[PDB]
Amino acid sequence: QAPINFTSRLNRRASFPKYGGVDGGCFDRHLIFSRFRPISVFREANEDESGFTCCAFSARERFLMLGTCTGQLKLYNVFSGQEEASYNCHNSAITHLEPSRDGSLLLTSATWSQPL
Amino acid sequence: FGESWKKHLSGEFGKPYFIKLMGFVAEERKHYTVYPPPHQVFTWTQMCDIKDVKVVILGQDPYHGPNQAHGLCFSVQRPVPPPPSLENIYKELSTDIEDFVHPGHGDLSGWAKQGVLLLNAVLTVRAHQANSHKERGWEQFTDAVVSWLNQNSNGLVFLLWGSYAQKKGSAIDRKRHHVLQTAHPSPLSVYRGFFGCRHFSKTNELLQKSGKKPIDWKEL
Amino acid sequence: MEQAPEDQGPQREPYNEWTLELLEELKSEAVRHFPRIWLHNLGQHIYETYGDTWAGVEAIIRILQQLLFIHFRIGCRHS
């Protein structure tokens, strides 16, 4: 088994295959998903308080398609932090929102609107 | 200001709340911005006379935004996009007037020469603020006007829609006049009753119970 | 190199009418899930504080859609 310390795995992977020992990549995922840090907060500075419901990223990871309470999805650059293109999508709200991997399609489902 | 209106409104001054009104609201004009100026308070007592008043429609609160209102109740300036409840009373006007023409604006300078008393209850409120003031004297100054018209002028009607208008002028007699009330003209008024009632005939129709100077809604 | 698409979707140019085409609809579902006690009382509470100024007209479509989303999210079948 790979050692519990990370520097002891780092010296061992220099003369052993990919991770360092048996169950070596598991320890590499303990140290790397047990810490998080907030980078940016995206408000909705139109009526002074945010109304977001659903969140997802785009198919190219530049924009992140948030979703308001009013039923419109608003694009935001992950680098800029700027409203780029709102879209009058639904009447009720946005419940679910996922894109496709090729970047050609987009599924959005609403709360009570007559097309759901 | 119209002098013939104050033929007998000289009993509006000598009360303990009148100097509370025209000084402190002037003091509010000397510190803050109450929105309608003195040259827009006196429009209803200038444009129409007191000799032809036939409809009494009250008004709760003025319009706190700058360059919007001009004194009459439910009324706004002509370059302002029209208010929604005044846009909401237009919906019944199509369903009852077959010759429905469209105003296209928000100035009510067309119905004011008919016989409608488009009176706001509190005539002035502050800029950008709805109901900041206390009872500084705008209420009972109008309460001494509304129930005074129960004596001298005649041929009125009360479409006192909304509970704010129900408290002020309910108990005026039904032999001399006619009082019909329903839900509010706003679409924010969940308990319905306004949404299709055909009250707007009964300006043209309840005057057939009197026989006075006629009305056309379509002066727009 | 991401090109955000052209907003050729359903536009809402008569905003004074599209609100009126839907503010009844916001009332046409909240009565189908909630008693009218809170509906008139919250509508009165904004009308005493925003009035007939469109700042309660969109704001009730804020508060109604903010509750009807979460009331269909907490786990009540109707309420």
CATH of C1-74, one of 1.20.5.4730, 1.20.1740.10, 3.20.20.100, 3.40.50.2300: 1.20.5.4730
Q: Which of residues 92-131 of B touch C (CB under 8 A)?
A: 130-131
**What was the resolution (in A) of this experimentally determined structure?**
3.7
Deposited experimental method: cryo-EM
SS3 assignment, position B85: helix
Give the separation between CA A34 and CA B191, rounded to whole angstroms: 54
Give the separation between CA B89 and CA B196, rounded to whole angstroms: 10
Contact yes or no for B59/B73 (Cβ under 8 A): yes
Sheet holding A83-87, edge to edge: A52-54, A66-68, A73-76, A83-87
What are the chain A neighbours of C10 within 8 Å (beta carbons)? 88
Return the closest-CA partner of residue B60 out of C36, C17, C49: C49
- Single-letter residue type at A69: C
Mutation site, C69, C71, C73, interface A, largest A CB count within 10 A: C69
Decide if C49 and B130 are in contact by the 8 Å CB cutoff. Answer: yes
- Which tokens sit at B154? 């005649």
Question: To the nearest 5 percent, what fractions of chain B are helix, strand and coil?
Answer: 25, 5, 70
Instruction: For residue B118, list its beta bridge partners.
Output: B57
Give the separation between CA C53 and CA B84, rounded to whole angstroms: 8
Other beta carbons within 10 angstroms of residue B208's beta carbon come to: 10
The residues spanned by each domain of chain C are 1-74
- Which tokens sit at A80? 């800029």
Length of chain A: 116
DSSP alpha helix (H) spans, C1-79: 15-18, 20-30, 36-47, 57-71
In the numeric block, the tokens 């700058």 are attached to B66
In degrees and rounded to multiples of 5, residue B96 shows phi and psi of -125, -40
Through-space distance between the first and last CA atoms of chain C, rounded to whole angstroms: 45
Give the C-alpha distances (Å, rounded to integers) separating B220 from B54, B63, B108: 19, 22, 8
Query: Do strands A52-54 and A66-68 pair parallel, antiparallel, or not at all (unpaired)?
Result: antiparallel
- Which tokens sit at B214? 């006629």
Q: Which chains touch B (3 or more CB pairs under 8 A)?
A: C
In degrees and rounded to multiples of 5, residue A74 shows phi and psi of -120, 120
Give the separation between CA B39 and CA B71, rounded to whole angstroms: 9
Give the separation between CA B1 and CA B4, rounded to whole angstroms: 9
Other beta carbons within 10 angstroms of residue A66's beta carbon come to: 22
